[PDB]
Nucleic acid binder design. Structure first.
Lengths: 188, 167, 260, 155, 131
RNA sequence: UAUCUGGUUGAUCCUGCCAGUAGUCAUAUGCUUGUCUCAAAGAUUAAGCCAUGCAUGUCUAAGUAUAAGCAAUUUAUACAGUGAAACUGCGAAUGGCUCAUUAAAUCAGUUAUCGUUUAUUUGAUAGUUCCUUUACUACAUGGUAUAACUGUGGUAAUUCUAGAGCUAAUACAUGCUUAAAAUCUCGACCCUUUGGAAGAGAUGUAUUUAUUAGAUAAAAAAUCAAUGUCUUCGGACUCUUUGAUGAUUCAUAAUAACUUUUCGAAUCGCAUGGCCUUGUGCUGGCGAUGGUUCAUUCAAAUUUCUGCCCUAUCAACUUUCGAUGGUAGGAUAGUGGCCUACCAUGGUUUCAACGGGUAACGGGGAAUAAGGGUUCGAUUCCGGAGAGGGAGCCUGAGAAACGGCUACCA
RNA sequence: GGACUUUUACUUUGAAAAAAUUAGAGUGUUCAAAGCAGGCGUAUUGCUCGAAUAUAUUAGCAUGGAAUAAUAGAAUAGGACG
RNA sequence: GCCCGUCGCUAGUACCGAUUGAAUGGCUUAGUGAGGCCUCAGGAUCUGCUUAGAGAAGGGGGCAACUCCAUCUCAGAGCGGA
């Protein structure tokens, strides 16, 4: 199959290389899953020396972390809108690492509104104790709240769905969120 | 002599790539596939033999068929297979209800019974109990050893404070 | 080349085993285990080529199958068991107790020891490394992994083990002036107290050594095994104690005992 | 090489995991990670002061200097963040008992922590394969610019 | 795939083939020591040649050199044990001296004649070879 | 072990070749061939083609025996002797054979993995597995579905196998369980104090992400938002723990989570007792096979530095359809233009690139003896490559295998 | 342990360095080519020596040298130390 | 005396040459393109989860109300698996 040796190819000097030995199994390369979105289907590839990868094709939910909240919610993924390698992975909503998706933005709400009582956008005793204890730490950020309003949160995929079978990523923040914002609305 | 094969359609013969555990092919090596000819599952004139099954009884007896009868050569060998072959419910001592076969050794009459597997026995319970016992024992073992290393580092820190007070 | 090399061509087989050139096309491939291939010694070579307690390897296998041999405790019925350095071979019949150890010719010596001395082992640590659930572990040269050691123990520190069980006792640190046994090189078999460790960061630490005869040699921090204090080892050294007689002196001593 | 822009690629340029929080008011803006390659190679000031990203940077990236440590003369600086150096040597031929001039051009990755030009005798350390022809990384610019200002004009 | 049953030859052989004088000398040696082939001269003179070789090799070394010590006096023990080298002239310069005669006159062939038991070197040959 | 000699002239001294002369682990062929030991051997040309036979199979007290098997006898009415077949397990990826291809490839000496996989062996390694959780979930142990076998059969023809009837598991597929503890959360009520609290939830390991601890360069202070421990109620806060490396984002640990849920024993043989609350209650001996993570070992894969024969009647070569590099992914067991997408225009070269040649596998080595050299190495040791050519791949720890399959060409 | 260092060729000693080969020590395979054996009493109940050393040249490492021979330095002083 | 070239005879070798000649080998365009591998679909059959009718079994333990665990069978509705 796909053979990731260097024994083909030219030498840096430019010379063309002969054919010493034949294709060896241990230098194989398998096809790109080209993982898609929606309805979990995951096939496991038998890799080298036992051990399995979980080639995922179609994935609707991933575990996404909020870097500045120390939490992670399993949310519903809703399409790619940017990818630094190819725009085909965006037009096709193909899920790869480093890809930028928009996620459910509703478990993060239900968590945040039940941790501050501040509620994004725009009575109990112990609960109010905890809320008063907190606050002075809930300014969020213009872009993350504005993200909340529409109900879709920019995240950046960080796991490898072809490999792991996971579609985990992180909510964007700071200069990175700024970069992808800029880069995103500019190309419309 | 070529065989048919359920779900290939065609009243013809097709050469198919056959694998483990599938009709008309018994492998000869670990993961050894083989492409062999096979006859379609659609009955035609090219057939020498047709494998049929009686599903509903007729209005007449059939000679070497309906008339004569022949018994299942074997009987239940596993525990619950016996129990539920007779529908005994888990109690009724399954060491009796197992069918025994008489073979006659000329002038000796032998009674041979199977070997009831998956039966709950004194030795199996002895083993299970040994497993739990051993697990718990080594659990507390490693706990205590952990405690003793903890104390080692403790009265190591003690000599730390002692020697550091010395100067 | 397609998989595990399961044979051993008798000509490749390590020379310190002392096998004869002719008569044979194969040798006992050391099985997997505690000792590296070319620094082990198959129980067939021991119970036959050194102990002469056999002829046919078949007799060897039979002997072993009647449990009449055991290494550091366990019986061991692997005909080509990879036994080696610092190990303890016990023979209940014969009442013999052996420690596998190097002479000075860097071979393997038929060394007999007490039944008492045959229940502790020296073991150079190869790694002091933290383990899972916090449990720190030391792993010595003979594959032995012992948990809960001593924060005073670091790499290359030798170790005395209960053998009967798996616990480290008094450990000998790697300092200047500690009696050292050389395991590898053409200065192996020798012994000599440590002089000075040339460092060289990530480049094989040389070890300067001087024996009990005022002779000096260097080696590397790999082939170096610590075994005590000057004059004061911890185990039974063989007849020569690693002084390496020169060729002429050997010509002298072997012709010194001359009169029948 | 790099210079300016730093963020000048389709993907965001960030050092892995080195997180800094927007809630946390800061004067440093972005928290930075660095180390030292070992072997007494002083991690240069411009590597810690720097603003670049290079994950192949030995001092502020995710590679490791190990194995052979070599030196050579710089014959090429064209490719971005990577140069070509020429180690010369003499090969002993016994039959004529004489050493003959020879050389080799090693391709070596150069972090944007240096200011390398053609000529600067330089010291590089082997690492992992980072490219098709790269196995070393510049770890000390021994020379300078070879008395280049010395050739000037009048008054 | 076995170990090689190694070997070597035991004789060198004259460069010039038809030098009358050496044919004379060699033939004399034959009719004096009762030899068979001219190979029993070549062989012995070749053995001797390797001996002389090692000898002049050592001679160049520094005196009382380790190898000159051990191997020099070893070869000395060697050439003495048989009766080729004299206990008198027993210091390797004489092994550089030497001659083929000293090897010839030491054969069992020769010594079974040297004190009777023969009367002629040929009866020595026959009697030896006949059990 | 530093040796020459014959042939140019009428005769001479030269240059210079020719011929002689000696060896060859160097083949062949010719004539003759008695004795002991040692015994290389279809490489060269045709890695051309092959009749027939044989060369990989394997069982311990210890996974499966209702053979309608043989034998008995000591019992052994569940089995227990031995044991064809068949299942299951492991092996067949070693070994042998050839030297075709192969010239910076292989190989070598020297390196690297802080760049990966590894059956095995070896030494370690697992109290949590259920769930609104008093009228409870088999664990005194849950589900079948198959061979062998019996039976009916098909074909000229193979280790071809079809329809039907049975039946095993350390095979297939499921699935209960065990002490304390404290920590992170939620919190019903009471009461405003300076603030506390029932008892409800989460906490094995593995998986994937994100965050954090992983100090240590010599020493001190003010403040902000959090917020811990003891009250000598203005407050202090003292003893406060720190692994490895030349080097890490290493080992190791924490939090928030995620998983068509990894593993955590429904396994087998010998014994068959200890103790009473006499329940067929409750414990308990030795060792076999398995079982996740770590180490270990046998390994493997890429890898640094330097080193090849002839050739210029080969001087430029590399970017077609990767050539040199940057970014990002994808793919790998993992590094990497290994592949893709974008971007740049780079890379080798008279210190001979690139190309051609080789009747070239590389090395240990071998033949020839002043020295320096020369020539040789298919071939008993190591490393590589192939099994008529090519590609493809199953199985598996490991094969791009060929006494494996699949396709194409011969 | 913090803080910095002109780069080399050359030579020295050393480490790392499979065995077979080779050079070569011991041992009378009756001799020799070989082999790594063997040699001793108490030969009716063990005693015992061995299975060496060397070469292993280029390149990498380690180190002693400081001649020979290259290299870099302060002249628009943009020098040296404090 | 020696001696050069054309020309003539026999034998051998190599060269130029219509045939745009012929043969083996390695690479390679373009077109066609088997095979297994990944992948969108497929669904002979063959079990299975959840919603329930029509007959019996087994009892959380009651004078009448009340109620738990495993198992087998078909007229009949959803959530998928090989």
């Amino acid at each position: 199959g796909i053979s990731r040796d260097s024994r083909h190819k030219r030498s840096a000097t430019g010379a063309k290389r002969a054919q010493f030995r034949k294709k060896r199994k241990f230098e194989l390369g398998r096809q790109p899953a080209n993982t898609k979105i929606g309805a979990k289907r995951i096939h496991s590839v038998r890799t080298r020396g036992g051990n399995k990868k979980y080639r995922a094709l179609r994935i609707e939910t991933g575990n996404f972390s909020w870097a500045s909240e120390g939490i992670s919610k399993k949310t519903r993924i809703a399409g790619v809108v940017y990818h630094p390698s190819n725009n085909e992975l965006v037009r096709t909503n193909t899920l790869t690492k480093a890809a930028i998706v928009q996620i459910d933005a509703t478990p993060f709400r239900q968590w945040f509104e039940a941790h501050y009582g501040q509620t994004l956008g725009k009575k109990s005793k112990n609960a109010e104790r905890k809320w008063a204890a907190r606050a002075a730490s809930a300014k969020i950020e213009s872009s993350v709240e504005s993200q909340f309003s529409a109900g879709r949160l920019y995240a950046c995929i960080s796991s490898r769905p072809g490999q792991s079978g996971r579609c985990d990523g992180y909510i964007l923040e700071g200069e990175e969120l700024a970069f992808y914002l800029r880069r995103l609305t500019a190309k419309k | 002599g070529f065989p048919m094969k359920q779900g290939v359609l065609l009243p013809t013969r097709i050469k198919l790539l056959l694998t483990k555990n599938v009709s008309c092919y018994r492998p000869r090596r670990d993961g050894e596939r083989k492409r062999k000819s096979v006859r379609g599952a659609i009955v035609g004139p090219d057939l020498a033999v047709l494998a049929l099954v009686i599903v509903k009884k007729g209005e007449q007896e059939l000679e070497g068929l309906t008339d004569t009868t022949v018994p299942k050569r074997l009987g239940p060998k596993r525990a619950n297979n016996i129990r539920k072959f007779f529908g005994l419910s888990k109690e009724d001592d399954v060491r009796d209800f197992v069918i025994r076969r008489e073979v006659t050794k000329g002038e000796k009459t032998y009674t041979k019974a199977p070997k009831i597997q998956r039966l709950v026995t004194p030795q199996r319970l002895q083993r299970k109990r040994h497993q739990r016992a051993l697990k718990v024992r080594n659990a507390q073992a490693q706990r205590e050893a952990a405690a003793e290393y903890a104390q080692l580092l403790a009265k190591r820190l003690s000599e730390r404070k002692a020697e550091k007070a010395e100067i | 080349a397609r998989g595990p090399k399961k044979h051993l061509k008798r000509l490749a087989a390590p020379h310190h085993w002392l096998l004869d050139k002719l008569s044979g096309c194969y040798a006992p491939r050391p099985s997997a285990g505690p000792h590296k291939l070319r620094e082990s010694l198959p129980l067939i070579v021991f119970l036959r080529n050194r102990l002469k307690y056999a002829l046919n390897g078949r007799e060897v296998k039979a002997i072993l199958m009647q449990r009449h041999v055991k290494v550091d405790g366990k019986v061991r019925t692997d005909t080509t068991y990879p036994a080696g350095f610092m190990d303890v071979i016990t023979l209940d019949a014969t009442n013999e107790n052996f420690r596998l150890v190097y002479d000075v010719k860097g071979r393997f010596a038929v060394h007999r020891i007490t039944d008492e001395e045959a229940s502790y082992k020296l073991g150079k640590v190869k790694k002091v490394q933290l383990g899972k659930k916090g449990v720190p572990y030391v792993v010595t040269h003979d594959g032995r992994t012992i948990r809960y050691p001593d924060p005073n123990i670091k790499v290359n520190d030798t170790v005395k083990i209960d053998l009967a069980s798996g616990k480290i006792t008094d450990f000998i640190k790697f300092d200047a002036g500690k009696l050292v046994y050389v395991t590898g090189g053409r200065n192996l078999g020798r012994i000599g107290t440590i002089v000075h460790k040339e460092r060289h960061d990530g480049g094989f630490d040389l070890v300067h050594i001087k024996d009990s005869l005022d002779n000096t040699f260097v080696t590397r921090l790999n082939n170096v095994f610590v075994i005590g204090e000057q004059g004061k080892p911890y185990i039974s050294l063989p007849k020569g104690k690693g002084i390496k007689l020169s060729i002429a002196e050997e010509r002298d001593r072997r012709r010194a005992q001359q009169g029948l | 090489s790099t210079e300016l822009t730093v963020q000048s690629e389709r993907a965001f340029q960030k050092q892995p995991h080195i997180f800094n929080n927007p809630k946390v008011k800061t004067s440093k803006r972005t928290k930075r990670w660095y180390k030292n390659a070992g072997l007494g190679f002083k991690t240069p000031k411009t590597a810690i002061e720097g603003s670049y990203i290079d994950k192949k940077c030995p001092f502020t990236g995710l590679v490791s200097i190990r194995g052979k440590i070599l030196t050579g003369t710089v014959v090429s600086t064209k490719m971005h963040r990577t140069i070509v150096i020429r180690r010369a040597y003499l090969h002993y031929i016994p039959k004529y008992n004489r050493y003959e001039k020879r050389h080799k051009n090693v391709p070596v990755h150069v972090s944007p922590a240096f200011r390398v030009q053609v000529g600067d005798i330089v010291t590089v350390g082997q690492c992992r394969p980072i490219s098709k022809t790269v196995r070393f990384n510049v770890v000390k610019v021994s020379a300078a610019x070879x008395x280049x200002x010395x050739x000037x004009x009048x008054x | 795939p076995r170990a090689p049953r190694t070997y070597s030859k035991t004789y060198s052989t004259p460069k010039r083939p038809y030098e009358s004088s050496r044919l004379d000398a060699e033939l004399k040696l034959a009719g004096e020591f009762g030899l068979k082939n001219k190979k029993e001269i070549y062989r012995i003179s070749f053995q001797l040649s390797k001996i002389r070789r090692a000898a002049r090799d050592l001679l160049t070394r520094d005196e009382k050199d380790p190898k000159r010590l051990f191997e020099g006096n070893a070869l000395i023990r060697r050439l003495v044990r048989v009766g080729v080298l004299s206990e008198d002239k027993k210091k390797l310069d004489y092994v550089l001296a030497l001659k083929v005669e000293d090897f010839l006159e030491r054969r069992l062939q020769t010594q079974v004649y040297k004190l009777g038991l023969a009367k002629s070197v040929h009866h020595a040959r026959v009697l030896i070879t006949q059990r």
